[model samples]
Target: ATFEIVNRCSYTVWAAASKGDAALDAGGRQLNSGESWTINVEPGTNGGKIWARTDCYFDDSGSGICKTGDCGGLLRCKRFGRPPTTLAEFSLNQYGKDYIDISNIKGFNVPMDFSPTTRGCRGVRCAADIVGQCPAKLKAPGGGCNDACTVFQTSEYCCTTGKCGPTEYSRFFKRLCPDAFSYVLDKPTTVTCPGSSNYRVTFCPTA
Candidate 1:
């Protein structure tokens, strides 16, 4: 038998499957960002499953969540075939929307919070939790430190002293998979930042 897998999302998806009771393996080749393929299924296969995963990225630093053209940094996994009967589809939506849907599987839903994207927080410390002395570069001439002066991306010293810090790129991975830090970046939209720019970020997750 033959099964056709489709890519409805804007980004490319890499697919793999497990046959019978064998371990799951990649589908031999990657599917285009917006393409589909047909796979051969051995007859009488008792157990089999398919998975498609991708890492999407965005071009602009503050684009926040990936959109159609900024969906290269997303990941998804789905199952195909019969038996164990777990038909799950996982995907990160545009605008940083993440969800998981299972048609045949139990205990799954749409708009699920697989991960949360956080921002403006220094390292793992929240903005409100920081306290104490400020860096020399950030202190005012009067010798007083301003906590409000702290903004994302000033420096670790700035961040630690409540002067400046790194913002959470996305809370999703942090909330769900704190041990795994993964992200994606879109291709350069233009050869130059300004002046007759035509290039734009292409969210081709598969390739």
Candidate 2:
């Protein structure tokens, strides 16, 4: 399985992707406008995610931070990226098929497109204008929308035990992107496909 990361935003975007305990393709990638980078992951991989960091500034020492999607303030992310990001998640060869979904459950930082670059697979994307119209209560000081989990930190919003369902906060995201995960218990976000597949993931699809 492989994925190409495309940056369509006017400004630069710092890309980070990971699978299980390992970062894919060195983990940190800086893409200028209209640029792209492809990461070829071995087959039979599982539990992967990709996200974009915005308004980032790094020195030659690779030390700095991002306005959104910061990962411990290091250019090379060794951990899961920070919040206020759009997530593209996947599990390759999961029970004989590939499982894929976009998630705004962690909050929205930028638009995204997760599509099969080759044939024999369907695609999904969520290119909504979330930050422009984010709710006052959910808006982050650094920009982008913050998820309920990060905002309230309650079981009702965080969904600690596989319990809980759609709430007003979740509906806000679901309304904009029904194809993406809005909350922990959202059921309509996942998609499946068979065979070895290659995907094209775009950041700021409508930027």
Candidate 3:
């Protein structure tokens, strides 16, 4: 069970087939640009399923260039990899533009989704508190202190303006433990200012 084929596009692709049902033929066999190919099967007959096709234009044009001809309806199979989850975490305010649509994320434990395409508007009005919302100058023992002082008094400090609040009732701590590292609210889940904030996927023992 092995199937790689990773050519994220940019041109260069050609890998045809047509054996059993026969009928497909037009000079195939070509795979360049960011190429990647791996094949190995034998666990269920047709190894699960197969049928390939691809072709794009540009770069020296050839016979019927830009031809995406009979992509065998774009078929593929052969799995076993699952190990990557946590598909949506949210929080990008600032200039927001969030958009996650990995096309339903097919097999092998899908997840890996992140947002924030920039314009974090200084950590969402300094609410995310990227160092008291950054303004500069604040070094030494937790950086000067003034957003309300108590730079690190050990959590729970925001009565009315002690700063470091918002981001939906902030209160996550972890300053170095189990290996040396802390501070992890890691998706408390609260999306609704614009939509989508926390969304974990990949845990289908059979689902």
- Candidate 1 structure quality by residue, lDDT tens digits, 1-207: 344555544545344455423423333234664565665544434334444433323234422222111112322212332111112222222233322222211100011111112321111111110012333332333222222213123344233454432224222222332322211221111111111111111112122
For residues 53-143, write the lDDT of model 3, one tens digit per residue.
3333333433333222232232221121111111122222224333222111111111112222233211110112222333333222222
Sorted on TM-score, best first, the list reads 2, 1, 3
Q: Which candidate achieves the best TM-score against the true structure? A: 2
State the C-alpha lDDT per candidate: 0.28, 0.86, 0.25
Q: Is candidate 2 or candidate 3 better by TM-score?
A: 2
TM-scores for every candidate against the unseen true structure: 0.28, 0.95, 0.17
lDDT of 2 by residue, 106-170 (tens): 99998999998777778888898988878899998887999989999999999998899888888
lDDT of 1: 0.28
Give the lDDT of residue 181 in candidate 3.
11
Number of clashing pairs per prediction, in order: 22, 0, 4
**10 residues in a row with least lDDT, candidate 2:** 18-27
Off by over 4 Å in 1: 20-28, 56-207
Query: Model 3, clash count?
Result: 4
TM-score of 1: 0.28
